[PDB]
Design an enzyme around this catalytic site. Structure first.
Site, PDB file in Angstrom:
ATOM      1  N   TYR A 156      36.863  48.602  25.811  1.00 22.09           N
ATOM      2  CA  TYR A 156      38.267  48.851  26.103  1.00 22.09           C
ATOM      3  C   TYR A 156      39.183  48.220  25.051  1.00 22.09           C
ATOM      4  O   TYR A 156      40.312  48.671  24.846  1.00 22.09           O
ATOM      5  CB  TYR A 156      38.631  48.335  27.488  1.00 22.09           C
ATOM      6  N   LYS A 188      22.282  48.495  28.159  1.00 21.95           N
ATOM      7  CA  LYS A 188      21.679  49.773  27.846  1.00 21.95           C
ATOM      8  C   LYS A 188      20.848  49.531  26.566  1.00 21.95           C
ATOM      9  O   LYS A 188      20.958  50.269  25.581  1.00 21.95           O
ATOM     10  CB  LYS A 188      22.800  50.813  27.660  1.00 21.95           C
ATOM     11  N   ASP A 191      21.825  53.191  33.966  1.00 22.39           N
ATOM     12  CA  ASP A 191      21.492  54.391  34.731  1.00 22.39           C
ATOM     13  C   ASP A 191      20.469  54.160  35.803  1.00 22.39           C
ATOM     14  O   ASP A 191      20.521  54.790  36.841  1.00 22.39           O
ATOM     15  CB  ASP A 191      21.065  55.553  33.845  1.00 22.39           C
ATOM     16  N   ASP A 230      33.016  48.163  35.482  1.00 22.96           N
ATOM     17  CA  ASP A 230      34.031  49.021  36.051  1.00 22.96           C
ATOM     18  C   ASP A 230      33.379  50.190  36.808  1.00 22.96           C
ATOM     19  O   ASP A 230      33.848  50.585  37.877  1.00 22.96           O
ATOM     20  CB  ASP A 230      34.931  49.528  34.908  1.00 22.96           C
ATOM     21  N   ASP A 234      32.895  50.164  41.305  1.00 25.44           N
ATOM     22  CA  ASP A 234      33.281  51.251  42.164  1.00 25.44           C
ATOM     23  C   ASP A 234      32.107  51.799  42.969  1.00 25.44           C
ATOM     24  O   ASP A 234      32.238  52.063  44.166  1.00 25.44           O
ATOM     25  CB  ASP A 234      33.957  52.323  41.336  1.00 25.44           C
TER      26      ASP A 234
END
Lengths: 363, 363
Positions: free
Chosen positions: B145, B195, B227, B251, B255
């Site tokens: 970000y 990852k 994943d 993030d 959620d």
């Protein structure tokens, strides 16, 4: 439903050739029902090509695939190889060369709840009961997995590593297109996933997706961020048709869709280029223990064939007819070993008999 | 027995004050039961502060927050404000200068399946029955970000847009610490999400995390890619304790966790810095609509008090008593606007009296 098609068939190792045999049975029932002229050539690849040509991907095999409308591919590893790696692998040495060879930039992975296993699904029964059918389209060649600069710099407390999320217009334009065409094949709704608050590359993605969409007025387009999309697959998976994703976001979301089916070992995969050439294969995983004794489940192979027909051979009608044969066998409880209450009512060969019989609308 | 402590209390706008007074009822029963000395001071923020003072984050509020061990924060915003600018009014003019000022780099988001709310969980029942209690720890200041360069460049085919995903060793070190510390107050497990199969920044993350693991040998560490975790959160949430996450991976995962509780109205949040100073608040926002002393649900606000006590005040005895109280309330089926059919609505105020009671101790 027509004449002209030729198909490179590459079973591979392990369960590869016993599960491709079931696919060729169902292909033969398709050949008769729809009066389609489809020839196949068989080719060695992976372990058996190691054994025959001392090569993971013999060169003549590449020629034969160059000469075909599509490749139907099985499994690659099975017995006893890869002591010498990695681009001297089967997997490494066959599958990604083929990818690179033919410009295969997209990866389609459908995730549909078959009646029969609404109980295997991980979602609340009242949710599973609404069902779903989602195609996740994933961009394969760009994004943060391959972006440059990439690397690691410094030492001590300010030592850093970095990767770059890059996308180019030519990349976003081609994958968008495959998504829209596929929604035309389906239910006419494209959800493009991005992070277009924070990410510059996600702003271009969006942008360009909205341009390409003008070319497809008959397809509805929505945008959703990756974290809302992770919640919504759980909450109501039935709202989505086609998901359009970058490399990273599609990796995540294609796996989340696989999980919510509750089956996974049953799923097909396609990798396409912009001309309609694809390589079609099970997503599941090679054999090996399971091999040779017919209890492999051929459905994911038989479903890679359905995909092959819809997408490379534009036989949508023929693709549904296999889909409905599988949906019928699953509703009846017919398993290799997925519901052995009163026996896993079928071997690999039997399962291949039943589907090919159902396509031939026999049962 | 004792303490020393002091809390700035910033109710905000809307339901902020109504549910904040229930929080403060509970701080009372805690002050009483565990013999603590905790001082509070109220300050005007966001909307209240624009009306009474002329700006969303007065110097005086800020000054007061510098004198506190923590900040317990309600909600901010209503449609009567923000017509004028972005980072100058209630939300952006109050809540993010706060974070900047106080160097808050970590975000803790608990997601716990409460018994009397099992049915709202969107997972299958037998997975819901096993329950879960996850703490997602998210890096807030770094990663993709905020990495540079970000931008877009060129025309035609190779027009590109990019973001850079940077981490330094100091950034990963400090967020890993608060994850391992957190795990010590919970079930002594950290799963780190990278990852690392392709990302250079993930590779370093995994390296530093393994380093830090050796300073907490009594805390079991596991690594998992984004994943897989996205799937495992569906198939077996009960396997997780603390998730240690980079900015973008946390993030997404935060959620996913929130959704699987099926009661996202109930969740608190903590942002901490290195010296243990936190801002604690509901994860959601004021409902101006619903503002008006007595239906807003106070549990998120109260659960926020619990986090402050545990992380900033180091009083997890008192935090668990609050969590035991809410747990008993909910299974008793008492609740503000989650379920009514036997005139089984209860007010904001009743809820606060009740949970304060159980903390005091039941009978």
């Amino acid at each position: 439903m027509s004449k002209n098609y030729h198909i490179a068939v590459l079973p591979g190792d392990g369960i590869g050739p016993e599960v491709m045999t079931q696919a060729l049975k169902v292909l033969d029932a398709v050949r008769n029902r729809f009066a389609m002229r489809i020839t196949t050539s068989h080719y060695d690849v992976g372990g058996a090509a190691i054994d025959n040509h001392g090569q993971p991907l013999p060169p003549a095999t590449v020629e034969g695939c160059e000469q075909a409308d599509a490749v139907l591919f099985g499994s690659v590893g099975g017995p006893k190889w890869e002591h010498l790696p990695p681009d001297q692998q089967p997997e490494r040495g066959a599958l990604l060369p083929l990818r690179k060879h033919f410009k295969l930039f997209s990866n389609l992975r459908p995730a549909k709840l078959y009646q029969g296993l609404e109980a295997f699904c991980p979602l609340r029964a009242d949710i599973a009961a609404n069902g779903f059918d989602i195609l996740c389209v994933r961009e394969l060649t760009g994004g943060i997995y391959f972006g440059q600069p990439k690397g690691r710099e410094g030492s001590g407390q300010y030592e850093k590593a970095f990767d770059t999320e890059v996308y180019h217009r030519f990349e976003i334009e081609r994958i968008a297109r495959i998504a829209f065409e596929s929604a035309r094949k389906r239910r006419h709704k494209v959800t493009s996933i991005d992070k277009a608050n924070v990410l510059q590359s996600s702003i271009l993605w969006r942008e360009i997706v909205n341009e390409i969409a003008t070319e497809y007025p008959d397809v509805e387009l929505a945008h959703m961020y990756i974290d809302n999309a992770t919640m919504q697959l759980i909450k109501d998976p039935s709202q989505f048709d086609v998901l359009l994703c970058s490399n990273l976001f599609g990796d995540i979301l294609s796996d989340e869709c696989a999980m919510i089916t509750g089956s996974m070992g049953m799923l097909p995969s396609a990798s396409l280029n912009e001309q309609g050439f694809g390589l079609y294969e099970p997503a599941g995983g090679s054999a090996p223990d399971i091999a040779g004794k017919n209890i492999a489940n051929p459905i994911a192979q038989i479903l890679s064939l359905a995909l092959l027909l819809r997408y490379s051979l534009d036989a949508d009608d023929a693709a549904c007819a296999i889909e409905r044969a599988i949906n019928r066998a699953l509703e009846e409880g017919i398993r290799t070993g997925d519901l052995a209450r009163g026996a896993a009512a079928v071997s690999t060969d039997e399962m291949g008999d039943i589907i090919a019989r159902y396509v031939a609308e026999g049962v």
